[PDB]
Amino acid sequence: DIELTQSPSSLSASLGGKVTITCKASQDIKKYIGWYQHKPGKGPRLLIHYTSTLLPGIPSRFRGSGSGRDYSFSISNLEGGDIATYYCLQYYNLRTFGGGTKLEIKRADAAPTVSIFPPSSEQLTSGGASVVCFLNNFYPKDINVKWKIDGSERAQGVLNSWTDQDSKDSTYSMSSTLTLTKDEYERHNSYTCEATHKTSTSPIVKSFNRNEC
Amino acid sequence: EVQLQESGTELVKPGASVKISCKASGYISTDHAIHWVKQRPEQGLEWIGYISPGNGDIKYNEKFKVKATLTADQSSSTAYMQLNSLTSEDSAVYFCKRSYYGSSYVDYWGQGTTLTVSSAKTTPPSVYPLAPGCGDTTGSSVTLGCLVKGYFPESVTVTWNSGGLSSSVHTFPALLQSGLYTMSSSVTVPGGGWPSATVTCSVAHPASSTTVDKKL
Numbered sequence: 001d002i003e004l005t006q007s008p009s010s011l012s013a014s015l016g017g018k019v020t021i022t023c024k025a026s027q028d029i030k031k032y033i034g035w036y037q038h039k040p041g042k043g044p045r046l047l048i049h050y051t052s053t054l055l056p057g058i059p060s061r062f063r064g065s066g067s068g069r070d071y072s073f074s075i076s077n078l079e080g081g082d083i084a085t086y087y088c089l090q091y092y093n094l095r096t097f098g099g100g101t102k103l104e105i106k107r108a109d110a111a112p113t114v115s116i117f118p119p120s121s122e123q124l125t126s127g128g129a130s131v132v133c134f135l136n137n138f139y140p141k142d143i144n145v146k147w148k149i150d151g152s153e154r155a156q157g158v159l160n161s162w163t164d165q166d167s168k169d170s171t172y173s174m175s176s177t178l179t180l181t182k183d184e185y186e187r188h189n190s191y192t193c194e195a196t197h198k199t200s201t202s203p204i205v206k207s208f209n210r211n212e213c
Numbered sequence: 214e215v216q217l218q219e220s221g222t223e224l225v226k227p228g229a230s231v232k233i234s235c236k237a238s239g240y241i242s243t244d245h246a247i248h249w250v251k252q253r254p255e256q257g258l259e260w261i262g263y264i265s266p267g268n269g270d271i272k273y274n275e276k277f278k279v280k281a282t283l284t285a286d287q288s289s290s291t292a293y294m295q296l297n298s299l300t301s302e303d304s305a306v307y308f309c310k311r312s313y314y315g316s317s318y319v320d321y322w323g324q325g326t327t328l329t330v331s332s333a334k335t336t337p338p339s340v341y342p343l344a345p346g347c348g349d350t351t352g353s354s355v356t357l358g359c360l361v362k363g364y365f366p367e368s369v370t371v372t373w374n375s376g377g378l379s380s381s382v383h384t385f386p387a388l389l390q391s392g393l394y395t396m397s398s399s400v401t402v403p404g405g406g407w408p409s410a411t412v413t414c415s416v417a418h419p420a421s422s423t424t425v426d427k428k429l
């Protein structure tokens with residue numbers, strides 16, 4: 001077995017420029033390394049084998065190079081349609097893949113439109129309360145959202161999931177839910193959602209005054 | 214033509230053992246070794262091992278030696294991998310692929326089997342409406358949401374406004390909360406004040422038979 005470090009993971013590429021992925025091995029692997037492309041939805045498509053030998057049908061903007069342990073993968077023209085994860089794969093002694101480069105398209109920074117949502121009444125009658133704060137359309141991906149009760153930072157109960165990068169806008173959105181029991185919820189009034197995002201120095205805070213407005 | 218056809222989703226309880234297949238049609242099974250490859254949620258690929266149906270040697274990733282058992286039913290060209298002691302960490306997509314020799318045209322991968330491993334049973338989703346409350350509302354747009362809370366297994370389709378509101382629907386991937394899955398979506402509609410067409414989110418969960426339409 002041989003370890004294979006590959007870097008970066010995440011590359012923000014601009015459509016029109018080049019990307020250079022790298023896999024460095026633990027032993028000399030003698031140019032037996034391959035490069036795969038893995039989009040969502042399908043199984044991995046092989047691109048290059050034995051370091052430099054392109055595949056039938058694979059474009060020459062993809063290029064591969066390297067020799068001992070060091071090897072590089074290069075896409076001269078990142079095309080709208082090369083956004084996938086690339087894994088390298090030695091096979092000089094059994095098989096080992098690199099962690100992969102996830103590519104995403106780099107674009108202007110954009111700030112999130114935050115919304116906070118109270119518990120729906122129907123959730124309360126069930127005995128629970130999830131407060132849900134949407135953070136829609138921003139860039140870059142990084143957003144750190146804090147949940148606060150009456151100025152009190154609560155961190156458990158928080159569930160977070162992000163959208164995939166939207167094909168026709170290239171932003172990311174996030175959802176943040178704070179799941180609390182009916183009782184905990186009824187004993188507090190202010191609930192605050194606080195996004196700390198690169199686009200603005202000051203945190204984006206949003207609060208709703210419980211029920212009475 | 215050459216196909217490697219894999220077993221359908223295996224849903225299974227922790228501690229158990231699963232056996233997943235790779236039905237090799239369209240070529241001579243003994244020619245190529247079958248490798249199995251593990252596909253990790255969010256990112257990553259891990260080689261498990263290979264069985265060569267020709268000379269019969271199997272070689273495993275050291276890391277998988279105790280977890281996986283690789284086998285082939287030569288008479289029917291179906292190679293199977295068995296996974297013993299399923300923890301929640303073996304939730305994943307598993308793939309088999311026939312080896313690629315020299316400079317061949319294309320590399321043949323199976324469609325993969327998803328194994329979601331757990332002790333939970335089918336549960337219809339609890340749907341709740343999300344509408345902005347009394348926060349002024351004298352402008353901007355409006356974003357409406359629906360919280361698909363607590364279901365098993367994954368498969369929930371949240372159609373907005375019975376399809377009408379395709380406009381900008383964000384649908385956030387489901388994550389595990391206390392043993393079940395929670396998920397949500399959002400639509401933004403043009404300016405303030407949605408009350409005209411009763412907007413409605415409609416979520417369906419196949420394994421159950423559930424169709425909830427929360428409008429208000």
Ligand SMILES: CCCC[C@H](NC(=O)CCC(=O)O)P(=O)(O)Oc1ccccc1
Pocket residue numbers: 033034035048049050089091095248250260310311312313314315
């Ligand atoms: C880079 C292509 C070389 C393929 C390897 N094949 C050779 O090493 C065979 C010798 C030859 O080139 O003739 P294999 O498909 O076995 O490894 C794997 C294992 C898992 C996933 C993908 C490929």
